[PDB]
């Protein structure tokens, strides 16, 4: 029943190409980088930390978040593979289950129902019987919605600062003063004193739980 | 299953040529045993009948012996001359047929190899 060695090598190397797709659509990465893409907008500096710094920070945070899932996959599936007690097909079947559970717990029921209806799937008895073709796009949709929620909530204190600074500038008759340049250093103050970066990463990690 | 169907005729003809070559070699080996009748196979008829057309035990368990399940009409060559030992092997005809069979086996190999070479050349890019 086991695949031949040539077929196993072909399948492994072929599946190695889907690494960015798996990372974006199956792991936490999508929620993280998107929030960063909004946070640099809230601070008033589109330049912000460089793009690569944010991407790598998101990658490290994603690895830390998926450490339990990676450990469970390593224990349940890949360990018998290395110790010759399982095939490649059975390993692929078994290792996806913890990742499927992780995806399902962050998946909104409405999106899952939408993609079921759109695939004309039969009556799914319970979460355990949800096909991956239905769980993947629904998870991506819920991920986007959650990331937008977090970003909009993040946008709040900087809006407070901008409004207060603009009101102070206008109450003094200084109407011709653009408040963005004045309020940018105070936004940096707010992010520094409250330890914005550490607080935000802790909040993201707790949100995934 | 189209690769099997496309190469089926030549592979089966090659196997039949090998079987007939074995039979001809057995004829040559027994050239001096008395009471032996030279035998052969009609190539064309057998080939068409193979192209037109056991029961292994059911291993439902994962721990039992696979066991075993375990067909050419042998036609007698018409003798040329009578011999007192009753040996109907005429060595001239058998040698001519041996050379012919070896040649046609090589031709079948060449044709099958050309088909495989063309099929593999199509995929090479």
């Amino acid at each position: 029943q086991s695949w031949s060695l040539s077929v196993q090598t072909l399948v492994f190397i072929t599946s190695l190409t889907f690494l960015p797709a798996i990372l974006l659509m199956m792991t936490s990465f999508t929620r993280i980088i998107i929030v960063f893409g909004l946070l640099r907008n809230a601070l008033g500096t589109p330049s912000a930390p460089p793009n690569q710094v944010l991407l790598g920070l998101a990658l490290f945070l994603t690895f830390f978040i998926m450490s339990p899932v990676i450990d469970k996959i390593y224990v349940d599936a890949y360990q018998p593979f290395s110790e010759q007690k399982i095939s490649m097909q059975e390993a692929l079947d078994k290792g996806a289950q913890p990742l499927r559970a992780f995806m399902l717990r962050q998946t909104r029921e409405a999106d899952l129902a939408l993609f079921a209806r759109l695939a004309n799937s039969g009556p799914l008895q319970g979460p355990e019987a949800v096909p991956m073709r239905i769980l993947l796009p629904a998870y991506v949709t819920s991920e986007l919605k959650t990331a937008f929620q977090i970003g909009f909530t993040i946008f709040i204190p900087f809006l407070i600062i901008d409004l207060v600074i603009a009101s102070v500038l206008m109450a003094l008759g200084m109407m011709m003063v653009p408040p963005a340049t004045i309020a940018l250093p105070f936004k940096l103050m707010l992010f520094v004193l409250v330890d914005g970066w550490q607080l935000l990463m802790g909040s993201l990690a707790q949100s995934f739980y | 299953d189209r690769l099997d169907a496309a190469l089926r005729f030549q592979q089966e003809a090659l196997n039949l040529r090998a079987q007939r070559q074995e039979i001809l070699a057995a004829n040559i080996a027994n050239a001096d045993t008395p009471g032996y009748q030279a035998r052969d196979i009609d190539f064309a008829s057998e080939l068409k009948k193979v192209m037109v057309r056991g029961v292994a035990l059911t291993l439902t368990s994962s721990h039992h012996i696979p066991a075993q399940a375990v067909a050419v009409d042998l036609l007698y060559r018409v003798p040329d001359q009578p011999s007192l030992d009753g040996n109907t092997v005429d060595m001239d005809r058998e040698r001519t047929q041996f050379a012919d069979n070896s040649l046609k086996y090589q031709m079948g190999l060449t044709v099958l190899g050309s088909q495989l070479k063309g099929m593999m050349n199509v995929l090479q890019g």
Binding site: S4, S6, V7, T17, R133 | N15, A18, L112, M119, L123
Partner: protein, 93 residues
């Protein structure tokens, strides 16, 4: 087990009543066919090496060549599919 025969009675009772294509399934079927052909050729060659009587060399070589052709076809199809996927995923939306 008990679960299995319940399933089989269910199968018969749907058969009595009677009387979505997925690309992943097709890819799995093609890979299984390639692996099965390769395994059959390998098993026949192993048996022939061990001196089994009812196996001929020409059949062994022809089966090995057919398995090689099938695996080459699989490799080429994979290459074309990967090229298409990498072209589609490189868009600027």
């Amino acid at each position: 087990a008990i679960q299995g025969i319940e399933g089989v009675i269910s199968q018969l009772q749907a058969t009595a009543m009677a009387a979505t294509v997925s690309f992943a399934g097709q890819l799995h079927a093609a890979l299984d066919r390639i692996s099965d052909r390769q395994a059959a050729a390998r098993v026949q060659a192993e048996k022939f090496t061990l001196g089994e009587p009812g196996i001929a060399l020409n059949d062994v070589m022809a089966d090995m060549q057919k398995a090689s052709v099938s695996m080459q076809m699989g490799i080429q199809v994979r290459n074309k599919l990967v090229a298409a996927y990498q072209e589609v995923m490189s868009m600027q939306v």
